């Protein structure tokens, strides 16, 4: 039902200055915090209205954590390079994805933490939140350090407590935008592409959250082979958009039907034009 | 609030 997730990106740039650290936080599909170390005096910035109501004790704390992580990830990028016996001239990336998931019950459903190196799975926290799954030999050197540091213990405690606790607070403060699901604005457009060939486009617009299911049915059956599905795209105003298209024979357009599925809708919708 | 433990890899 609800989730709080943090996405980290550490990037080495030999000769182009000190490694760049980007931290970004989300409550479901709504971003609320940002941090870029590339700024003059780097600070945590709000990206949602319901987070601006937080006091400076919160803001100087986020800045402290992310400033510390910037230093930690400079050392981590340097160390992983040594593990993989890589050139000091190459540009490498460490990415972290951690967070907690909540069911409709409001209780912790699942805690997670995953780390990557150059777009490849590196070190992940197991479902028990006690052990590590190291992808290779180098990732086992990181694991042994993280075992002695008691990362899994203090991370499990955070994901079960503080993560869930703060997510609930963010969900209450933003109950009007976060807990209210915007349904999509639908319509189907006709675009002739030949003498007897035409394209039907089913539009799903201004919907929140991002999860949607758009399908074209020719008199009751699905057309996965014909259905040109477009990737869900952000409208740029905290809403999302997607479209489904089918090339049909002229006259037979009416036998084609679009089915849209979203949580903002009480029951699935059917369109045809 | 983010995780408050920064550990070197």
């Amino acid at each position, epitope marked *: 039902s609800h989730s709080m997730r943090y996405f980290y990106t550490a990037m080495s740039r030999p000769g182009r200055g000190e490694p760049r650290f980007i931290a970004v936080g989300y409550v479901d599909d709504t971003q609320f915090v940002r941090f870029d170390s590339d700024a003059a005096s780097p600070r945590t910035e709000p990206r949602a209205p319901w987070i601006e109501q937080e006091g400076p004790e919160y803001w100087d704390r986020n800045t402290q954590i992310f*400033k510390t992580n910037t230093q930690t990830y400079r050392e981590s990028l340097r160390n992983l390079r040594g593990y993989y016996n890589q050139s000091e001239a190459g540009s490498h990336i460490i990415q972290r994805m951690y967070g907690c998931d909540l069911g409709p019950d409001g209780r912790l459903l699942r805690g997670h933490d995953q780390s990557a190196y150059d777009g490849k799975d590196y070190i992940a926290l197991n479902e028990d939140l006690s052990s590590w799954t190291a992808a290779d030999t180098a990732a086992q050197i990181t694991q042994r350090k993280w075992e002695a540091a*008691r990362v899994a213990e203090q991370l499990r405690a955070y994901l079960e407590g503080l993560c869930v606790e703060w997510l609930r607070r963010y969900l209450e403060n933003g109950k009007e935008t976060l807990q209210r699901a915007d349904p999509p604005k639908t319509h189907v457009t006709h675009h002739p592409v030949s003498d007897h060939e035409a394209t039907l486009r089913c539009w799903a617009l201004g919907f929140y959250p991002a999860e949607i299911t758009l399908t074209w049915q020719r008199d009751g059956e699905d057309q996965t082979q014909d259905t040109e599905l477009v990737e869900t795209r952000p409208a740029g105003d905290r809403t999302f958009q997607k479209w489904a298209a089918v090339v049909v024979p002229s006259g037979e357009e009416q036998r084609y039907t679009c089915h849209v599925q979203h949580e903002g809708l009480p029951k699935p919708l059917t369109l045809r034009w | 609030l983010p995780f408050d433990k920064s550990t*070197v890899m």
Partner: T-cell receptor
Amino acid sequence: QSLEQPSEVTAVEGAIVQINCTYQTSGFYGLSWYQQHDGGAPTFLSYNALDGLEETGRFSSFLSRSDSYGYLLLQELQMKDSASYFCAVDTGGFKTIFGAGTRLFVKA
Amino acid sequence: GVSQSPRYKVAKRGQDVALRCDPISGHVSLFWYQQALGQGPEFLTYFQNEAQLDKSGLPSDRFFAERPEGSVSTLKIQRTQQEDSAVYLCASSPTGGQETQYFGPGTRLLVLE
């Protein structure tokens, strides 16, 4: 952001002793214990992140996060155990808050 | 282990003092602490390699901590006062914060008139 522990505790050689520590913070990350002899370096004993018991030979430390309570238990008391024992609370980050310490007197 | 020099130091008021700390090799994290009689160590400054991430615990701007190379750390106390008298302990952690700390024997500083 503080913690409490008794000033002094006394026990006989071969006996067991308990040093209680209550912490009062808003974001607990860990409860650790340190041994310090007069004019010496504080040495690590045990750390508690999650609830339960941590055993390291004659030293064991308990933790309860719901009660914000933790204690250190020392077995088979020797004369070298006469020192100051400190409980430390980690609240995320790096700033560690130490207690005033408990001076243990081992009676021969 | 962690070494610290000098073991003891007596100084006159207004004089500058320098305290050296040699932590364990490979320890990314470094801490400086002040210890008063009948009390525990109180945080002064934090280091992650050469970067001084915090110094909120330092009493005055007379206090200056450095670690140019992320190994040896020095603490210079410009114009000493009687209130500066305490044991200055230095500690280190291998890979970051919220971990097991490894302490030095500390410098017992006594400032006099």
